[model samples]
Target: MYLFTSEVVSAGHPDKCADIIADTIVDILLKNDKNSRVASEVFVAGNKVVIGGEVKSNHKLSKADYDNLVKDVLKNIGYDGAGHFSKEQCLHPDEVDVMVFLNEQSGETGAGDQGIMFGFASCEAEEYMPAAISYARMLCDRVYAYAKANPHELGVDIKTQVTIDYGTKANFENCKPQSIHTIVVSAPCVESMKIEDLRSLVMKLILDSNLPKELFDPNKTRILINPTGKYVNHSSLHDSGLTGRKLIVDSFGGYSPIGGGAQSSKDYTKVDRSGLYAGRWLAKNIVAAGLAKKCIVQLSYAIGVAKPTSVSVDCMGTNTSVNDDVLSDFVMQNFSLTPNWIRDKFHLDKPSKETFLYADVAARGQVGQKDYPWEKLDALEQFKKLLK
Candidate 1:
């Protein structure tokens, strides 16, 4: 049996904190000015939060605005100085120091920078994602939500991982996952809580996580909770966080290759963000249409260019209705994958509570969720037409 694994980090994790902060800035700018061009990055360490990068928008934010935004984001993430840990022991919104180093955008139109992005889809999970990562995210969300609600017993900074065993399968596309091999969860707890008690409580949460019954055997699954022992001191105080550091956690969870650039800090005009969405939309549609069991879409772009340099597809030798070459050709003919086209296709420029917000996407994983406009199967009918 071969074991495949994937991991997820909660919003309170330092890297995710940085990502959320950066995306929050992008959201504010885009909301005020739909044509805003932004590429902001954030770094979090201990009591300091640094914001950098470029922005070209009519909406202006003052130093107070940046400070307020960073504090608000931290408070929302359960760092409000109300948890079990003290302000000095753990990160608190009130104690954080904010620094901004933003500049104007370099270009008025076209991609922000040259980069290659990848999108992936598979029939292994209901969301058309790799099984291990999907399950890991689900568990992380459940545990993180619980920790947020019960701040006295748990800390928000959490990590979850899942490993699946595929028995003697040479090709994952042709076979299904066997069962969960192991589950690892690392979360901070109040110093008063006993390690054994914490382990039991976390185990209960896992059992109630609604994982596939057929794929999980409690007796056989190795559950590791806080394997490193007490984790009372956590957050940015214990580790540093930077934007674009959790790219694998944001995308297919190491199941596929990711672009060099990160998505959270950039606006829709940045091909790194928009191209990934467009590519994922295409790959997901391909799988949903039963054209393939697995698919990966690649889009390469040049800086200040309207059209992508190339559009490619790989089915991992799992195409059912057509070859990879045919799928690639179909995508090129059917879709005009320019930055502007992608922005319009998914309404990226206009993010709201009614639609989708970039900050929320940043907190959660970028792709896979059906609520995200790009994850919609709008092209299912067109893709299915190719089967005839």
Candidate 2:
């Protein structure tokens, strides 16, 4: 079998708008000892914004505080303007209607929002992402973090692509990626910015960041930065911003289906959100068990249902064990795919919050540094035993 590659971008890019917000909510819950019920959606374009959803928070915070919280999240993501996606972007935290619901139940964590959600992992990288997707994720995150801290290196709007070479590159096996064959980057620079000079600097930044440099040798590698040339203003001002748009980036860089739902703008109790996390936790453990090269697990739920309607497993043509259904049964017995179990398992009500800043995850992708409590791999060993 040959190697196939796909890339996932980082937080600083435009597509990250949805990611930062969702995680912000996660952080909020974890910081407080209470469980939260929140479902907030966002929309942006040339400075106009709107976000409305359900939230049952135990905290005694008002709508004004919620708006400020949302704004704080945006600025943290590097969008501090007022026109579109910056601080100057004219979003008055107080003027906006940031609603909330207070549902403090000791036994069951109430669902604030409803929909589908998916979590995924692959053996391609330590993070279980596809080859190209992992590389792109690293590159973009590196560039954005670099530019944000050292604005001299690059701009906010940027895109990175990574191509992998399996046989033509190196010795690799299983779901692991061998080497990165090509890295294509497109950034926004100024007129005074010498194209060659800036490109050279970009190359150095990427190389110094520990990417596989040898794969892109003169004849072997392709490095293109700011291919479209000169990019000035960006964010929602440049386009419209919406929640749940970067599903692929949020999941597996399109290498696999995360699920039929969006993870952003929803609370943890929503079976879709927590169930998806459980699915990824399950899939990663199975792959680590050497059961398959890759795995995709789907858990579907109907509104108001405590248990998932259907749960299935997919190995992406890479399994070396019992049928997926048998594996699914094993997962059901050992772990709870239901909404209730997920909240307690991850301690969702225990002040877990994730923030989303305004940016372009729709274009760049969503592999942010911001902690997502759900992606935690601590449960790997628990599932490994079930296989035995």
Candidate 3:
């Protein structure tokens, strides 16, 4: 059996907390200047928070504004003066030590970093994503909702890992989930609660509530809840947190290759972020247009380059008609891979609620969401026309 394991961390997780802080700053900058150049990084440890990034913006923020923004992000993520990053825990937003060293954007306009970004789509899951990641994300969502609904019992910093056994020699075109091998859930609980009770409640409320019944055998599936037995305090106190550290969780969850960059804390001009979005858009449309049951769109960029240095496609032998070579050519012809073109087409700079909800967007996998402009299959007609 081929066991595929994937994990998802809640927004309260330190790394995610760092992402939230950085993206909130990005949203604030974008609101003031549509052409903001930001590469913010946040680090959280105990009661101290450090934020340093390169920025080129028309508006500058005051120290109070930064402090308030940090607190707002903490409040929105459900961290009050109670648990996990609570005031009592020393990691509270209002009480933490704040440091910001933001530099003004340079006069030169060029790509901030050079990297390859990958986007993959498949019929394996309804989200057009791999089964392992989709399942893990579902569990993550459930725990987040549960913690918010019952704040007194559970903490916000939670993680869930789902392992699926696809069996040997599985078919990509008609892939069916074989069985669930294991499920590992790590979540913080109130000190008063017993371990057994927490495990039972988690299985009933979060796992069983969100996971599909037909996908696995409950009796055979191993469930591990806080395998260490005790998990009272969660957040940066337990472990240091930094931005751009959860790249695997942000993307395919180890089921496929990542383009090798973090998605959060950057503006639209970063091809690593925009390119991944565009590549995912193209791959999703390719699958939706019946070009293949599974597809991976690879895009590479060089610093100061306006267009992609290289573009390739892999169908994993799942294509029914068109070969990957022809498909790749069609994509380059129809889709504009240039940084400027992608940002404009996806309207990445448009100020809206989405820009402000950057933390939630960071939590929710960027793809698979209907509202995310990049995840939409808007170019299906063009793909179909090319095939015809």
Candidate 4:
């Protein structure tokens, strides 16, 4: 058997903090003006946070408004000074500094920048995501949720990694996850808790509760918790964070190639954000339709252009009916991978609590979640029809 690995970080992780703040701005702008154009980035370190990028919208914000927004985001991330770590040890909303450097967008309605994006789906997990990354994300979510609830006991910054053993197979298209081989969790604990106690607590509350029983064998699975022994100092205070730095964690967990541009900071008009959704929608539908056991859809676009430069698909010899070429052709002929088309198809331009929110997406992940609008199988019937 061979191993494949993936890792995920908690929302309280410094990089994700930046992503969440950036996407919060995206949501606020979209909520105010449906036609807003934004390409923002965030950097956080040592109690200082900076937001810089271009934005074109009817809505506006003052410096105080930006400070408040940043503070609120941090507080929600469990950095409200009630946690185990102090402001000097970790980021606290009250003590942090906020900076805004926003400018106007340059051109009309078009892609904010040109880039190639990839979308992938597999039968390895119920969410149609790769097994390693999916389990890693689940473990992270569980641990982070517990940390958020028990702020006095656990610090918010956390990281989890999962490795799956896939039996002898040529490619991922045909390979199936055999078992969970290893799990790694790194989370800071209150100084009052011993390392041994923290390890057992994580095993009982996070690992055993979250991982799949059928795939995980306690006797065989190698589990590591806080391998470095002590992790009291964490968050932006210890390590700097930047938006778009966690692209692999944000996308298919390195199971598939990601675009050069990041999705969290860009508006719906930006192809880097919208095009990814479109590609994921198509690839997910292809797998959901029983067209392939695994599929990856790639789309390349040009800035200031409406239509995509290229659209392609790869089934990796797992196509049940037509070949990958036919699937690619069908996508190109049937759908328009334009910025506006993608925005309208999935309601990207309009984000609210009732609908999907970019900030939530940023906190969780860009794709592979069932609740995301792009994950819906609306085109399943169309793909199924191709078989007949």
RMSD of each: 1.5, 5.4, 2.4, 1.6
Shift in Å, residue 69, candidate 4: 0.4
Predicted candidate 3 versus true structure: per-residue lDDT over 81-169, tens digit per residue = 66533455425555777888877656134455678988988877866887888888888888788887777778889899998887765
Using TM-score as the measure, the top candidate is 1
Off by over 4 Å in 1: 107-109
lDDT of 3 at 359: 55
Better of 3 and 4 by lDDT: 4
Per-residue error at 93 for model 4, in Å?
1.3
Error of 3 at 313 (Å): 0.7
The models' CA-based lDDT, in order, is 0.89, 0.59, 0.80, 0.86
lDDT of prediction 2:
0.59
Q: Is candidate 3 or candidate 4 better by TM-score?
A: 4
- The TM-score, computed over Cα atoms with residue i paired to residue i, of candidate 1 is 0.98
Q: Could you give candidate 4's per-residue lDDT for residues 1-388 as a string of tens digits?
A: 7788999999999999999999999999889998887888999999899999988879887899899999999999889987478777788788888888878776235665678988888887867888888999989999999999988888989999998887666645484778888999999988788889889888886545657787898889999999889767889888999999998998788778887778888888778788788888898899888889889999998877778889999987889999988999999999977877887789887787777999999998998877888999988888999886
Task: Give stretches of model 4 more than 4 Å off.
Answer: 107-110
lDDT of 3 at 326: 92
Find the number of clashing residue pairs for candidate 3.
3
Residues 108-178, candidate 2: write the lDDT tens digits: 43343345555455676645656677677777777877766654445555567777767632234455454
TM-score of 4: 0.97
Worst 10 residues of 1 by lDDT: 104-113
| TM-score of each predicted structure versus truth | 0.98, 0.78, 0.94, 0.97
